[PDB]
Amino acid sequence: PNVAIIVAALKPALGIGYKGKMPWRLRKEIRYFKDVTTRTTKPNTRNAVIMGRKTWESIPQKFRPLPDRLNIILSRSYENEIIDDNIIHASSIESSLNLVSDVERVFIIGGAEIYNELINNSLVSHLLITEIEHPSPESIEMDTFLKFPLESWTKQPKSELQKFVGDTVLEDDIKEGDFTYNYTLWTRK
Numbered sequence: 767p768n769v770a771i772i773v774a775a776l777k778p779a780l781g782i783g784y785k786g787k788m789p790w791r792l793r794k795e796i797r798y799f800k801d802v803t804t805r806t807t808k809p810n811t812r813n814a815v816i817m818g819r820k821t822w823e824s825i826p827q828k829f830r831p832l833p834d835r836l837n838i839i840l841s842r843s844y845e846n847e848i849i850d851d852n853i854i855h856a857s858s859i860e861s862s863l864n865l866v867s868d869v870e871r872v873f874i875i876g877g878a879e880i881y882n883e884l885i886n887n888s889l890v891s892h893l894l895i896t897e898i899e900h901p902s903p904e905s906i907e908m909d910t911f912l913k914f915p916l917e918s919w920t921k922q923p924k925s926e927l928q929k930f931v932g933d934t935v936l937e938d939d940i941k942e943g944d945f946t947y948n949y950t951l952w953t954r955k
């Protein structure tokens with residue numbers, strides 16, 4: 767099944783957090799994340815979200831598990847097991863897929879350690895990067911960064927992203943405060 771990374775990062779250094787939290791609250795970006803990770807093409811299927819343990823624990827109490835999606839939590843301590851109908855515990859993406867039944871799309875949703883490893887895993891064929899801009903990038907506190915060899919990847923045209931997201935609205939240069947952001951798709955060369 768189709769495995770993709772979905773992330774929002776501040777250019778050009780591709781920062782994603784400071785002190786274990788996100789340096790922005792972008793309202794439309796959140797809805798985009800929600801729609802893309804939920805939308806299925808075929809009947810009787812749903813999407814999977816894979817995340818690290820720390821990321822799982824960072825999600826607001828009443829937002830976890832993320833509804834309408836199969837949640838996979840990663841820990842190097844976990845046994846490959848099905849907790850309930852919505853939650854799976856695993857020690858690798860390799861194992862979690864073998865435990866999965868009838869999943870259409872798989873989304874890697876965080877965090878920094880999970881991103882920086884799975885980026886070089888050949889099962890991952892797509893990057894969904896919300897590229898964020900700011901007039902003064904250095905003036906925002908940042909400690910955790912993406913380590914993406916984007917030279918080895920190809921930014922696709924908007925029309926390929928539009929096919930991927932289906933009937934989802936893709937606006938240009940979304941301005942929330944001083945931040946400006948765009949949605950982009952990447953594939954392996």
Ligand SMILES: NC(=O)C1=CN([C@@H]2O[C@H](COP(=O)(O)OP(=O)(O)OC[C@H]3O[C@@H](n4cnc5c(N)ncnc54)[C@H](OP(=O)(O)O)[C@@H]3O)[C@@H](O)[C@H]2O)C=CC1
Pocket residue numbers: 772773774775782783784785786787788789817818819820821822840841842843856857858859875876877878879880881883910
């Ligand atoms: N902008 C964005 O789209 C997003 C940004 N973020 C940011 O990222 C930061 C979180 O990153 P981080 O602290 O690294 O959290 P992670 O979600 O990456 O948690 C890391 C944990 O995942 C487990 N793990 C890591 N690698 C593997 C592996 N290969 N196989 C199995 N388990 C593994 C380990 O658990 P264990 O110790 O149990 O073995 C480890 O402790 C936050 O600051 C947040 O702001 C997060 C999500 C999205």
Ligand SMILES: CCc1nc(N)nc(N)c1C#C[C@H](C)c1cc(OC)cc(-c2ccncc2)c1
Pocket residue numbers: 772773774788795796799817821824825826829874875876896
């Ligand atoms: C920015 C949303 C987001 N956008 C994109 N493009 N990629 C991502 N990987 C995430 C993400 C994320 C993590 C899992 C997260 C952390 C959190 O705690 C800070 C709250 C939410 C969340 C708030 C609102 N609704 C559902 C989930 C999501």
